[PDB]
């Protein structure tokens, strides 16, 4: 809004449409699911404006789906009707702290009727605690926040594919009708010029058989197919005649080992493809088949009829014949052509609302099954709607989705941007969609229809390239699940503000200009040649009056995270992709500063996320502690915003919040009152501005490494706070109950000196490896209580305690201060899982300073580890004495081909040393003063729009007019370079260096976690080998490639030692350690246990595998 | 070509002392239990090897067959039980060769005794050529 | 370790490997969490579950070494024997090995000339087959 901080923008054109809510795709969909008041408001608002909207909420129609249910005879019936919600039992924070699910009770009016008697009995049924989504878009389940990512799937409809028989070099065409939930019928032609249907992926049969399996007869078939050779030929090849034999033979092929009967075959067909229950060609599918085949207005909630299959036959045989245009079956004029699988009419988005709808549908189907069982099994006059409804299926189905699905997964809370863009993904790898290996190329490649809907640049850098994506900045999910993008209606060549949202299929019929196309005071176009993106991804200029639409914004194509990057057009897409990916791993820092040079996108990105405390209504601030902000509203109410302080995240960071307003400030609705982690004044701040000089330096920033001054360690510029939880549970074993007791058995007084009276460590204490975070004791251990030991104890007179010390301890390699303790117990009202009596969760916090080993990065994919931290004097310094903060190799910039970081550096220096270019009558100065960036005070933050940013010439010109510091000192020359000095010798460097301010991000790849070491530790069960994973103190996988390497070296004894002694030789493993600790030769290896298990396994496979000697049986 | 192809196998059996009668099984060995362990998972659960499920299937059907033989059941029932025992041992040795696989807890197929030897993750290519080792460490790499 | 050979496993070889017969389709008691008897994970046929112990407890004392108990039938020795000790199950109806039959063509037997479909029918009790004919007496 107007209250955003000051940032000077270089934009030369004005976008008439502002970026919509960056979480609408989730919250609107889930409002449609619950059908709450917001969705009704949206529906009526859309109806007023004459848009297209879903008039039926998600659960309304789902209960309608399972509405009519009856027993065998239907003597009685059960129906469901209007549903509604009760307010949640707990608030969101209550759920977060107490390990609950943020859910609201759902209540429906289930009606039971006895049709023979005519009696109707209504009763309100508890349908369960439906989980709700937070305002952000996350869901709180079992104490943790989670995101349900929308799925990018193939839309239901009819696809007409083509291919080439390579052996015969012959055209082949195929047709396939996809349902929302039913089964397919693959229909192939031109194999031998012989059309053939394939039902349920069984063996193919001729069309004429199945078409004879319905009312159609041979005479009518020839009547309305009397022109196409292929199907006449199939009919001649057809042997079965008449309907009944057709049903019998389709039953035989589909269902072998079964009696052929008319009734069974008719029932099978009707159940499989013509039953509104088993087969669902939803309104998305109904619309697709209506538009493709031209079928005119069938039952909008219908299944495939005869007409659909006959229309597919007509279309496919006309594809074979070479026809290109025709009149669709009972409809308008369609074009005969083959369609793609990557196009964005042939792909759709299953949002969170529709996903939860599907899962509720499965749960209600199982509830319907149980209700039918109880309907037939039980008797009338004692049956009420409650009496036969079991809602456990529904509850378990929702829990299954929110606990096990691949599309519902933990929020990425590394920083506000990572969480925000976790909620704009368009995932493909998941249930009902593609897979890692099945996916080929054309799905993993950006399509001309991705423009404005899916981000070309943001994408995983691993196996999931092209599968997991990200919604564009202006994307809007259609009712049917397609994405739409806005476009200004260019009416007779004069632009207008009338924005129409178009999808890829309606986009491929129009000529689309560019937002940066030159335009005059009158909205008519200026230049004759106006470049346009035309159908098929074919850029091709036109007169201008010909033009029909224009892009609303020149960053419509880009996503949010990639829109962060300034000077994106000066980078190759590879490094832009890497930079956008790695910007999400940025740790939040103690003190956060928004970038000195950035895009006009940090404010809206942070505001539309959920880490920035905003104002619900206008008013005035009253009380501002660090923990809360109390405001007196202008409507006469009060609101107290409680702020989170050093709260652990899913990834171990902190969500500390800091206030922005003082206790006199006039607030407005939407204004930011406090900032979340990695935010400054409601503007994202993922890293810090560092002074960088591009140069080699004594081989320390060689090969992409990084050198930075010790200033950043002293000042805590790149420091962070990380919190680790150590949860322990007190069980009840067979021998008794476990208790959390301070008096640990047989320990020294100092170890538990820092333990509370209840056994837990004291808050504020500092912990090192081996420190007892929580003291616990087993009730006893059946270790030595044999009659011998019993006699020994009886004679002793002292019953030696047999308790096991299971005290929770700090994992080795961790330190910090105990920031918190939480205790759940069974004696109190706190819920616990069956078996555990007490649950102690201790939070230990630590401060990480940037050290040699960490990983820094910029917004251009320019990442490198930290190699050296110089004393502040050793680092090169400018003329007036200021040292530079970081040293980056200039080799990477041209070879990696990302010359946008140098532009960022120059503009950062330019912004730090503000300029004054008012009234120069030069072109760059003229542009900067007409825009309004001619005068800029030092330290001002500047905005570089991702396609309307600062020009290279402007940067150079401004560099000449940078406000001086000492007299007219302008350390940086117009060449972009400054004269530096050698901090280790003092001599000036031979030539100027390029210096300036660049935003450096501290990535969550932390050196502390990666350091993994082992001498001995946990082995595996079947194979007596070291286990994997760091937390297990695991070993390192010495793959077979390494065995090849050691064999090539000829290192025989080393390979033997490390294949047997270092792993998988029990006696060798024990004796090598014994020999080293005592001091002795390492023993000769033996037989690996892996070999023993191998021979036993293949013996169990009944192979007499005997290790034989040349004189008999060789030692096992 | 067919004659020489068959002659390969016939000569293989002829030259060696191992008789072809080993190709039909009357006893099935059971792999030692510790190679197919079941362990108490927290929450009162048990994580067990798929081999236990397959052995349970074959023993179930063998015992039911023995009962059916004792009662002198008709030919059809004993034939069905013998066919089922055959399919059970087939799944025990290779779950995927014939018919649909025997799924375990989820929809995923169970693990056969021969599925533990082949594949990328089999015994040979995951535990005998490449092993996790002691006295080993790792960390990020910096330039000195 | 001069060589390592594999051939066919006869019935006698399998019986020679084994120490007892698995007769029950039961692994352990869900309540007391112990091996059952003559089932999978059994302790009489496989090794003791605990070092130097036996099922019933008469020789739970560690002093005994290698003797056989007189009530449960579990010998007293180390608990690692369960990695090595094997058992068998005697089938009532003989069955074919899915490897040596119904497998890769060159190893599909061919000792008895039969198409894959014919063996599919014979093995899975769907068609009969003659094992003997008195041709001389028939003539």
């Amino acid at each position: 809004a107007s209250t955003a901080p000051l940032r000077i923008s270089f934009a030369k054109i004005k976008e008439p449409l502002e970026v919509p809510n960056l979480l609408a795709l989730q919250t609107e969909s889930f409002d449609w699911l619950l059908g709450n008041d917001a969705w009704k408001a949206r529906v009526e608002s859309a109806l007023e404006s004459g848009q297209d909207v879903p008039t039926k909420s998600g659960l309304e129609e789902i209960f309608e789906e399972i509405s009519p249910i009856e027993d065998f005879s239907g003597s009685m019936s059960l129906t469901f009707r209007d549903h509604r919600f009760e307010p949640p039992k707990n608030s969101i924070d209550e759920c977060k702290d107490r390990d609950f699910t943020y859910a609201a009770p759902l209540f429906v009016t289930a009606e039971f009727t006895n049709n023979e008697t005519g009696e109707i009995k209504s009763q309100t049924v508890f349908m369960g605690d439906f989980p709700l989504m937070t305002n952000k878009g996350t869901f709180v389940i079992n104490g943790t926040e989670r995101v349900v990512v929308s799925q990018l799937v193939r839309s239901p409809g009819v696809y007409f594919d083509s291919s080439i028989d390579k052996t015969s070099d012959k055209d082949i065409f195929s047709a396939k009708i996809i349902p929302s939930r039913g089964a397919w019928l693959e229909m192939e032609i031109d194999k031998r010029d012989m059309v053939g249907v394939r039902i349920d992926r069984k063996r193919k049969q001729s069309v004429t058989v199945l078409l004879k399996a319905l009312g159609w007869t041979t005479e009518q078939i020839l009547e309305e197919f009397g022109e196409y050779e292929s199907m006449r030929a199939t009919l001649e090849k057809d042997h079965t005649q008449g309907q009944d034999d057709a049903l019998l033979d389709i039953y035989r092929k589909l269902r072998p080992g079964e009696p052929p009967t008319r009734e069974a075959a008719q029932t099978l067909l009707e159940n499989l493809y013509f039953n509104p229950k088993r087969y669902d060609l939803a309104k998305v599918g109904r619309y697709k088949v209506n538009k493709k085949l031209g079928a005119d207005e069938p039952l909008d909630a219908g299944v495939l009829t005869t007409d659909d299959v006959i229309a597919t036959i007509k279309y496919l045989v006309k594809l074979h014949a070479g026809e290109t245009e025709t009149v669709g079956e009972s409809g308008r004029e369609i074009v005969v052509e083959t369609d793609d699988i990557d196009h964005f009419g042939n792909r759709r988005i299953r949002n969170v609302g529709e996903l939860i709808q599907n899962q509720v549908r499965t749960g209600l189907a199982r509830m319907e099954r149980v209700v039918r069982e109880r309907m037939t099994t039980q008797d009338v006059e004692a049956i009420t709607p409650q009496t036969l409804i079991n809602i456990r299926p529904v509850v378990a189905s929702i829990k299954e989705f929110f606990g096990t699905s691949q599309l519902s997964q933990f929020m990425d809370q590394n920083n506000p941007l990572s969480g925000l863009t976790h909620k704009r993904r368009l995932n493909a790898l998941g249930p009902g969609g593609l897979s890692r290996e099945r996916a080929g190329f054309e799905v993993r490649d950006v399509h001309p229809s991705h423009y404005g809907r899916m981000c070309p640049i943001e994408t995983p850098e691993g196996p999931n390239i092209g599968l997991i994506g990200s919604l564009a900045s202006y994307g809007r999910i259609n009712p049917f699940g397609f994405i739409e993008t806005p476009y200004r209606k260019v009416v007779e060549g004069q632009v207008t503000d009338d924005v129409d949202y178009l999808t890829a299929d309606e986009e491929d019929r129009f000529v689309i200009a560019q937002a940066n196309a030159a335009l005059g005071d009158d909205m008519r176009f200026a230049e004759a040649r106006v470049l346009v993106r035309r159908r098929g991804g074919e850029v091709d200029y036109v007169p201008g009056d010909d033009v029909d639409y224009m892009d609303v914004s020149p960053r419509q194509m880009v996503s949010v995270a990639t829109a962060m990057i300034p000077f994106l057009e000066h980078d190759d897409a590879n490094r832009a992709l890497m930079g956008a990916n790695m910007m999400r791993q940025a740790v939040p820092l103690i003190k956060s500063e928004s970038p000195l040079v950035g895009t006009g996108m940090e404010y809206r990105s942070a505001a539309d996320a959920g880490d920035v405390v905003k104002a619900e209504k206008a008013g005035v601030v009253q009380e501002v502690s660090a923990d809360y902000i109390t405001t007196t509203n202008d409507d006469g109410t009060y609101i107290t915003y409680r702020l989170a302080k050093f709260s652990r995240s899913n990834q171990g960071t902190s969500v500390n919040q800091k206030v922005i307003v003082a206790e006199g400030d006039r607030i407005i609705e939407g204004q930011v009152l406090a900032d979340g982690p990695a935010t400054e004044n409601g503007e994202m701040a993922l890293g810090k501005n560092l002074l960088v000089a591009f140069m080699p330096w004594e081989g320390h920033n060689y090969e992409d490494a990084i050198i930075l001054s010790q200033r950043l360690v002293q000042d805590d510029v790149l420091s962070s706070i990380h919190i680790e939880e150590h949860e322990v549970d007190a069980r009840d074993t067979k021998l008794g109950p476990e208790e959390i007791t301070r008096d640990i058995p047989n320990v020294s007084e100092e170890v538990l000196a820092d333990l509370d009276e209840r056994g837990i460590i004291r808050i504020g204490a500092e912990v090192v490896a081996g420190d007892i975070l929580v003291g616990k004791v087993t009730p006893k251990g059946e270790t030595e209580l044999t009659p011998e030991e019993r006699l020994l104890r009886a004679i002793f007179g002292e019953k030696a305690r047999e308790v096991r010390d299971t005290s929770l301890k700090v994992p080795h390699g961790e330190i910090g201060k105990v920031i918190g303790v939480r205790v759940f117990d069974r004696e109190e009202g706190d819920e616990l899982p069956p078996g555990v009596n007490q649950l102690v969760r201790v939070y230990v916090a630590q401060k990480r300073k940037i050290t040699d080993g960490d990983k820094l990065a910029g917004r251009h994919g320019n990442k490198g580890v930290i190699s050296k931290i110089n004393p502040i004097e050793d680092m090169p310094f400018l003329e007036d004495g200021t040292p530079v903060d970081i040293i980056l190799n200039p080799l990477a910039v041209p070879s990696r081909m990302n010359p946008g970081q140098v532009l960022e550096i120059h503009l950062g220096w330019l912004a730090s040393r503000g300029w004054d270019v008012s009234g120069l009558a030069e072109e760059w100065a003229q542009r900067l003063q007409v825009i309004g960036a001619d005068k800029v005070e030092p330290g001002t933050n500047v905005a570089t729009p991702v396609f309307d940013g600062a020009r290279e010439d402007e940067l150079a010109g401004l560099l000449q007019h940078t406000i001086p510091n000492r007299d007219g000192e302008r350390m940086v020359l117009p060449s972009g370079k400054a004269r530096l000095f050698d901090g280790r010798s003092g001599e000036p460097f031979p030539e100027p260096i390029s210096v300036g301010y660049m935003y450096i991000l501290k990535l969550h790849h932390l050196v502390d976690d990666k350091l993994h070491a082992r001498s001995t530790g946990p082995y595996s069960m079947i194979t007596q080998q070291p286990l994997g994973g760091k937390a297990q103190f695991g070993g390192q996988r010495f793959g077979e490639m390494e065995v090849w390497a050691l064999e090539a070296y000829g290192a025989a004894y080393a390979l033997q030692e490390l294949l047997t002694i270092k792993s998988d030789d029990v006696t060798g493993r024990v004796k090598v350690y014994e020999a080293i600790v005592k001091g002795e030769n390492i023993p000769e290896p033996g037989i690996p246990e892996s070999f023993k298990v191998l021979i036993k396994e293949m013996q169990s496979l009944c192979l007499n595998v005997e290790v034989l000697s040349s004189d008999g049986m060789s030692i096992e | 070509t067919r004659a020489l192809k068959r002659l390969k196998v016939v000569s293989a059996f002829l030259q060696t002392s191992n008789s072809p009668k080993g190709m039909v099984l009357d006893c099935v060995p059971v792999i030692p239990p510790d190679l197919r362990p079941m362990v108490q998972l927290d929450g009162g659960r048990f994580a067990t090897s798929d081999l236990n499920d397959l052995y349970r299937r074959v023993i179930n059907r063998n015992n039911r067959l023995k009962r059916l033989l004792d009662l002198g059941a008709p030919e059809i029932i004993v034939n069905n039980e013998k066919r089922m025992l055959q399919e059970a041992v087939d799944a025990l040795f290779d779950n995927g060769r014939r018919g649909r696989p025997v799924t375990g807890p989820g929809n995923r197929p169970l693990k056969s005794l021969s599925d533990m030897l082949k594949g990328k993750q089999g015994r040979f290519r995951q535990n005998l050529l490449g092993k996790r080792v002691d006295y080993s460490a790792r960390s990020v790499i910096v330039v000195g | 370790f001069d060589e390592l050979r594999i051939g066919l496993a006869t019935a006698d070889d399998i019986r020679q490997w084994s120490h007892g017969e698995v007769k029950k389709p039961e692994t352990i008691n869900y309540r007391t969490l112990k091996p059952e008897k003559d089932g999978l994970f059994c302790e009489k046929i496989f090794g003791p579950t605990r070092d130097w112990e036996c099922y019933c407890g008469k020789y739970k004392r560690v002093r005994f070494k290698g003797i056989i108990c007189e009530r449960c039938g579990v010998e007293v020795t180390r608990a690692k024997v369960r990695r090595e000790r094997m058992g068998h199950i005697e089938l009532a109806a003989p069955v074919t090995h899915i490897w040596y039959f119904k497998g890769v063509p060159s190893r599909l037997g061919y000792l008895l000339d039969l198409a894959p479909k014919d063996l599919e029918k014979v093995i899975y009790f769907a068609a009969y087959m003659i094992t003997f004919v008195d041709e001389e007496r028939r003539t």
């Binding site: 082995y1019 069960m1021 079947i1022 007596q1024 | 362990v39 499920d53 | -």
Partner: peptide, 26 residues
């Protein structure tokens, strides 16, 4: 169903007994 619903804890998952469960004696 009776035999199934009672104590349904035996999950035949070899991805926890082998990889995640280590030997008690190291």
């Amino acid at each position: 169903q009776r035999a199934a619903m009672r104590h349904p804890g035996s999950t035949a998952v070899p991805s926890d007994e082998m990889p995640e469960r280590p030997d008690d004696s190291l």
